[PDB]
Amino acid sequence: KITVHFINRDGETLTTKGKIGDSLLDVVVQNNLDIDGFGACEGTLACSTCHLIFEQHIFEKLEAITDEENDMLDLAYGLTDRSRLGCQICLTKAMDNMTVRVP
Amino acid sequence: DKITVHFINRDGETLTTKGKIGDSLLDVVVQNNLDIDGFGACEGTLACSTCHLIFEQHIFEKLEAITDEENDMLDLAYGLTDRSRLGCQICLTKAMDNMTVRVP
Ligand code: FES
Ligand code: FES
């Protein structure tokens, strides 16, 4: 299991654990993280609520983005150069102790 | 609450409740605890399509003009029709009394 920190929109840092292979939405849902609206479509690429902003060194080694994710991601609020839809990103060793930001 | 709205749920059952002019249809659903699975998940912030509703033609054609934002998100909705709108963007007016909207 690995530690993941979430900077929520209110500014509070949510520290929690997930298992390698778990999506970031899985992490939010299982641990009942208090992130308003997160995971609206329950990970079917029909919403932008699971948008997360990653550290650059983490972002650059994420799995190649699919066109389906990109179309949904295009509509997210507060898009950055390090943005992905969290329901598509699964935990890896390199993410231990990483921080993600909820825009 | 002064006007009646009939919601045809995904199971084909009709849920009837009331709201006041000025409320969104999302408000009407969530404030009355209607049993519509996952409806309103992004909380009216135009970031999902879980509040998708299908309107009868005579009501649909009287609705407020759809924004590009709403249209862009509605495009990717399940069961999108010509008479579809995002419910959280639709404010109740007096004309909507006894209208029927359907959840795909
Ligand atoms: S939960 Fe909707 S696209 Fe990620
Ligand atoms: S509740 Fe998400 S867009 Fe209407």
From Swiss-Prot, chain B:
Tissue expression from the record: Detected in adrenal cortex and corpus luteum (at protein level).
A GO CC term attached to the entry: mitochondrion
Keyword Electron transport found: yes
Note on how the cofactor is bound: Binds 1 [2Fe-2S] cluster.
Residue list for modification N6-acetyllysine: K2
Name of the protein in its database record: Adrenodoxin, mitochondrial
Keyword Metal-binding appears in the UniProt entry: yes
Residues of the full protein shown: 63 to 166 of 186
Purpose of the protein: Essential for the synthesis of various steroid hormones. Participates in the reduction of mitochondrial cytochrome P450 for steroidogenesis. Transfers electrons from adrenodoxin reductase to CYP11A1, a cytochrome P450 that catalyzes cholesterol side-chain cleavage to produce pregnenolone, the precursor of most steroid hormones. Does not form a ternary complex with adrenodoxin reductase and CYP11A1 but shuttles between the two enzymes to transfer electrons.
Primary location class: mitochondrion
Keywords per UniProt: 2Fe-2S, Acetylation, Cholesterol metabolism, Electron transport, Iron, Iron-sulfur, Lipid metabolism, Metal-binding, Mitochondrion, Phosphoprotein, Steroid metabolism, Steroidogenesis, Sterol metabolism, Transit peptide, Transport
Assembly: Interacts with CYP11A1.
Gene: FDX1
Location in or out of the cell: Mitochondrion matrix
Molecular function via GO: 2 iron, 2 sulfur cluster binding; electron transfer activity; metal ion binding; protein homodimerization activity
Binding site for [2Fe-2S] cluster: C42, C48, C51, C88
GO terms of biological process kind: cellular response to cAMP; cellular response to forskolin; cholesterol metabolic process; electron transport chain; hormone biosynthetic process; P450-containing electron transport chain; respiratory electron transport chain; steroid biosynthetic process
S-S bonds: none
Necessary cofactors: [2Fe-2S] cluster
Residues of the 2Fe-2S ferredoxin-type domain: 3-104
Family: Belongs to the adrenodoxin/putidaredoxin family.
Residues where N6-succinyllysine is found: K2, K94
Domain of life of the organism encoding this protein: Eukaryota
